[PDB]
């Protein structure tokens, strides 16, 4: 039908705009942040994919949890995640953020940031190489490409 065609094309356009302009919050915790810095460095140049850091959570689309999340830090991470406008996405980077990693059995460490926020992509490694993080970002782009918000609204 014509309505399904229109909503599918509109879904395609909106998904393209959102996956081509992905602005992660200037946010990192530990050694993994160093690899993230290397992903922004000239060799990989994430800006050439349209990925740009912005300090304000109001102006950011992606949270990259790059480093260990402690109990003392968890409320602050939750706060700055809640202050991101929607749509918003979370990338968990490194073993510490993924499940606790080296410090899993610690009294002061959250055993994976998915206990605090929902996670779209898990990037393994300690730390993941900048290339592995770029692969995870492109995987998130492909995941955003598959959303069917307007089709599902039309089928309601």
């Amino acid at each position: 039908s014509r309505g399904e065609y229109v909503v599918a094309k509109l879904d395609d356009l909106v998904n393209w705009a959102r996956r081509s302009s992905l602005w992660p919050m200037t946010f990192g915790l530990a050694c993994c942040a160093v690899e993230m810095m290397h992903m922004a460095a000239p060799r990989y140049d994430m800006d050439r994919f349209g990925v740009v850091f912005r300090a304000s959570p109001r102006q950011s689309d992606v949270m990259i949890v790059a480093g260990t999340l402690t109990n003392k830090m968890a409320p602050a991470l939750r706060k700055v995640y809640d202050q991101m406008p929607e749509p918003r996405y979370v990338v968990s980077m490194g073993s510490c953020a993924n499940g606790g990693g080296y410090y899993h059995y610690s009294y002061s460490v959250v055993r994976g940031c998915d206990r605090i926020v929902p996670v779209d992509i898990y990037v393994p490694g300690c730390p993941p190489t900048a290339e592995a993080l770029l692969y995870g970002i492109l995987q998130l782009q492909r995941k955003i490409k598959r959303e069917k918000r307007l089709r599902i609204w039309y089928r309601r």
Partner: protein, 208 residues
Amino acid sequence: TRPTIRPRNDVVHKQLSAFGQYVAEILPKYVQQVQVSCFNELEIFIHPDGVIPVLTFLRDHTNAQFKSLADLTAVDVPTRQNRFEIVYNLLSLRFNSRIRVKTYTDELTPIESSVTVYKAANWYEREIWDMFGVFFANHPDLRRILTDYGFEGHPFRKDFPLSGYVELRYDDEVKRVVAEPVELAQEFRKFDLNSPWEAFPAYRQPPE
């Protein structure tokens, strides 16, 4: 005993022994023991009351001039009536030397704060209070430094469990991060590693 074995230094050993005798002679009121290790490190074991007079001496005496406080930490030994060993590591740049000062305390006995001797001690003492529960008297601002706000207990004590007692998660009914008693999907696996055969005869204790 050639390439594999670490070489010895008799000159430094003798110099450190002589300086330890010097310090013990100058401050008999507080010095309980002096030791020089075989890798040339000098330790002075003192009564707690002498924390301030000894450190000040080691900082201000013309022949000591230990102006730098490299580190200040505590060690927990539950078998001792005085649980906590307080360790000061000092560096003298004038004489290119290092010294260690050791004292003891239990759970309920305060130790005099040494911020008037070394300002660097401030945070170190906070950390000790945070991790071991040792109270420092006359500290300018004593409070937790490393643990979460409201955290209960002193994690670095030997009887504190490795994973603690509470863990954190986000709860949607109350819309906030909450603390609940810790539950582990996989329990940490305790390993018994000690060989039942003695390794070092030079450290054998009398069989009581």
